[PDB]
Amino acid sequence: FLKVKNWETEVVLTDTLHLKSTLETGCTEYICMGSIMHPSQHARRPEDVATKDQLFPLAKEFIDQYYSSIKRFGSKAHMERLEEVNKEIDTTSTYQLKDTELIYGAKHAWRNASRCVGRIQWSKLQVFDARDCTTAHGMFNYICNHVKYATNKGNLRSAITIFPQRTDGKHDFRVWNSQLIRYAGYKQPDGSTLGDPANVQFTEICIQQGWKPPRGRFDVLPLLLQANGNDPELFQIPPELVLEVPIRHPKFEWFKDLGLKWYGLPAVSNMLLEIGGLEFSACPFSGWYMGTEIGVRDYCDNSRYNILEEVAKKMNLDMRKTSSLWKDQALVEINIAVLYSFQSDKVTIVDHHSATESFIKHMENEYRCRGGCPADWVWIVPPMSGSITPVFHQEMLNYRLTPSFEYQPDPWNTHVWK
Amino acid sequence: RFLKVKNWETEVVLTDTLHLKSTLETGCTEYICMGSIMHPSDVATKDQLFPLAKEFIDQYYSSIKRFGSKAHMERLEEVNKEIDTTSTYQLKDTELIYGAKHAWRNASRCVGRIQWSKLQVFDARDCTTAHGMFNYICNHVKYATNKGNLRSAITIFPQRTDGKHDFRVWNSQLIRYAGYKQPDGSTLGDPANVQFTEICIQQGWKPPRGRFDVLPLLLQANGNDPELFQIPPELVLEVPIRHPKFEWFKDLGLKWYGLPAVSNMLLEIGGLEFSACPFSGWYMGTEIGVRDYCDNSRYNILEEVAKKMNLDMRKTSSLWKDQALVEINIAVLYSFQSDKVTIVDHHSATESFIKHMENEYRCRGGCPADWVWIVPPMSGSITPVFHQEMLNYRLTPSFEYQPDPWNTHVWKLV
């Protein structure tokens, strides 16, 4: 057993769930790697098509967990399912999940995501089974339906669309975009960057593939979709499906003249979903924003839109020295504007005070019913005003449970073109 | 073996080899990370002390480029004699200074370590009574305060012997404000110090019962009962807090003390334990402006400031707390700078820490750093440390936490 304490409330929780952790964290009793982005390469199954003794134990573990979850461990259906999975692996080197298992696996991958502050919502996830997809055109159709469903005219709904699992590693389905909706970035001749600097490389691949860039500050990128290991294909998302919020400020009438906007739907498309040894390399999922993701990171990171200087100028702050806290002062006003703007357009958004309070409640729920909740303090604490949120004062234990979402390489680093 | 850390803002990659020198526990395991746990988890025998002493003497003679020398070998022989005959040993003055500086250098939770080699070390190992401790501490406060031009310093009292004769400063810091619980459930002064305030009162302290009463010193020598002393008021430098634009801010009546002086930690050098070792530097503004003033469990002034700012406090999404938090921290920095009392803002402090970290990697092979503590409690991602991967491990000499003395002390009077 392990205890975590909240230093504000003195609430103490006792963790037993960590006994079921599967993968290394990267830490040891002599070194802590808690602030490393990718601390571990420990995987549950090796590189490509596993042998029977490598895959079946992982499948058995997941099926056991699923049938335990529904109070049917050792039931007739449980033992038949094991026999069935055994024959599938025997004859195809893989196996196929039932619809119920796929849904259970996706929801638990979200429930197990230690870096996600939004998990109080984990059981309210709409799962779209796209495992019958065969072409990039079919992927585009599935993604359009996902975006329209999840956007829901601003009343956002969490969703995941799951394309065919990896087979041999040469027939991967991939969304080359990091998110379904991102803005292009362009290297300028004078050395600067127009648009989102984070997407410069992906933007160049799109242009190189035939995309005609309008070369503005907020150009929605095309989709670059790879089916069954083939070369990726470009598609324009119909603009009526792309909900955007123009950013204005409730007090500063000049703020609108900065010309800022953002999109409403955060839709991660570069991660891998791992369920029982199966690897779903294309599994775009979406929820709704916490305001700081846009107002602190997207807008104010030095390597992103980097707007602090512009905003502080318009505010007439003393920008001569750091100790005037002009960056901090502008940072708050920018984040007021983002929240005010989404709320004014009735687009779902959560501020970091409400989000972190919900997460503390979610932790307490999980310790009561599940005996723990894996949580990564470095990622859960918001990137502004940290200690005036309750999660700053909350001790957390981090460990890796399966099913899970994993990072994977960018496909342009691995794809051999045809 | 090597380990790489990356900065995701700059893409600089640093290579850590120094971590191979750790041999004490982080608290984590191969399958669980406890990096956000505040405290993960009588005296050394002869056999335990031998290898600890050797490792320290070895590293000291290596630092002065005398490893393997005649002097090195004779020092090791001398140390082993003392352990064999007395069950402990005594550091040379050079070794004490080196060890104190390196405990600071090794403090993975400290963002101010670019200053580590400029530490003034006061050797107080000849002290025998609480009155002598009081004298040493007054001299430290006066030296460190230096009329506002603060200088880092540490004063080292005699090491633990059998654990029954410990020297302890019972205060958590040398200068702190009292807190008083009221019958109606409210608190006057600093809520963090209510418990220590009660102990002082019970020992005979007559409290003024104000909002900013400087606490007396409660000093324990040689395992005896602790004794009360009033710090001479002219040695306590304080800064009234005002704001460069809001003339009403001074009406809040806020002030703080200039000298941050930690007195409840333990200094370990070569297996020796210095249970009383108060040390001091200068403040980073957020320590006062974010934590001391705006923690819900501390002075908790966000509401009053947001009121006077005419902020909309009905909804969290107005970010009224965030807005008030920034102005309070502007006031703290402005006030200290106007009074010419050393202070550093979190932007300057984290920039210097990154420079320090890179230098340490280049010349030492690494820099143990605790991201959870290094990143400031406000505006985290607009400081460079937020984007810097770090490795946390325990090197010795080190500063350690220890139990509060009133939880272990067995009283003697009547």
Ligand code: HEM
């Ligand atoms: C419903 C509202 C949601 C909110 C407010 C939310 C919030 C967040 C935030 C703020 C982060 C940190 C992201 C960053 O700093 O870049 C995060 C990470 C994460 N979220 Fe959630 N999230 C939500 C829904 C979801 C859903 C539906 C899923 C999956 C089905 C999910 C899976 C994850 C994962 C795996 C991570 C960490 C991996 C990574 O981003 O590198 N989240 N979340």
Ligand code: HEM
């Ligand atoms: C010179 C200016 C210094 C600055 C600006 C500075 C800054 C800081 C800050 C902001 C913290 C976190 C404190 C907290 O959040 O409660 C810290 C922790 C720490 N500091 Fe430094 N510090 C300085 C000097 C020193 C000195 C002189 C020593 C010892 C010789 C020292 C040893 C430590 C240790 C051991 C910790 C972590 C242990 C703990 O506080 O729980 N620091 N420092």
Ligand SMILES: Cc1cc(N)nc(CCCN2CCC(F)(F)CC2)c1
């Ligand atoms: C579903 C969702 C909701 C939300 N509110 N925010 C996010 C942001 C995730 C950002 N995360 C960055 C690292 C990565 F790119 F590798 C994977 C995605 C996702």
Ligand SMILES: Cc1cc(N)nc(CCCN2CCC(F)(F)CC2)c1
């Ligand atoms: C020397 C110094 C300088 C500075 N600028 N700030 C500090 C703050 C240390 C706070 N830390 C809290 C936990 C503890 F009480 F156990 C030990 C002290 C210390």
Ligand SMILES: C[C@H](O)[C@H](O)[C@H]1CNc2nc(N)[nH]c(=O)c2N1
């Ligand atoms: C639970 C969490 O570890 C705790 O609140 C820590 C977070 N980081 C901190 N960082 C600093 N500098 N000081 C602190 O007291 C804390 N508290």
Ligand SMILES: C[C@H](O)[C@H](O)[C@H]1CNc2nc(N)[nH]c(=O)c2N1
């Ligand atoms: C190195 C460090 O871990 C890295 O900058 C992390 C810090 N915490 C974070 N937290 C969130 N939510 N998102 C991030 O991208 C990061 N980046």
Ligand SMILES: [Zn+2]
């Ligand atoms: Zn760890």
